[PDB]
């Protein structure tokens with residue numbers, strides 16, 4: 762409907778796949794080459810389904826900060842025959858607050874879904890499902906089951922992936938450029 766939705770659509774149409782693990786279907790963001798991200802609670806194994814194709818996992822790393830605290834981001838390298846468009850230049854360098862963000866989801870349950878969530882707070886610490894978690898962004902939208910892995914964007918930036926909610930607020934794990942240096 763507007764330039765926020767335009768940026769979000771451009772990321773969904775070229776940089777997302779549907780990932781299936783034993784713990785469900787997730788929106789998965791492809792970042793560059795065969796490297797993608799997914800919430801750590803997806804419990805990625807040796808094999809994953811990518812758009813319903815059996816795919817070997819070449820590497821999977823559940824990220825933690827240098828306090829050895831959960832970040833809820835798993836970086837996956839896929840044995841896929843095609844590279845992602847490189848979107849690393851759209852990743853923020855620093856922890857920050859944002860205005861006017863969109864949460865975008867693409868699954869069998871929620872195809873072509875876009876939610877204007879508004880203001881995003883650098884929330885920081887969250888007890889996420891019992892797990893102490895750092896680098897959490899918060900938005901005041903009643904997000905539901907099925908939105909985990911959803912991409913959070915502003916006009917110009919890919920800033921996080923949806924990882925949970927409390928019924929009134931939704932929470933995303935930050936994406937930072939430093940996670941994807943090579």
Ligand SMILES: O=S(=O)(NC1CCCC1)C1CCOCC1
Nearest residue numbers: 849850851852853854917918938
């Ligand atoms: O400076 S950024 O936040 N991150 C870049 C990562 C590689 C070089 C800088 C950039 C994000 C997109 O909007 C314009 C600013």
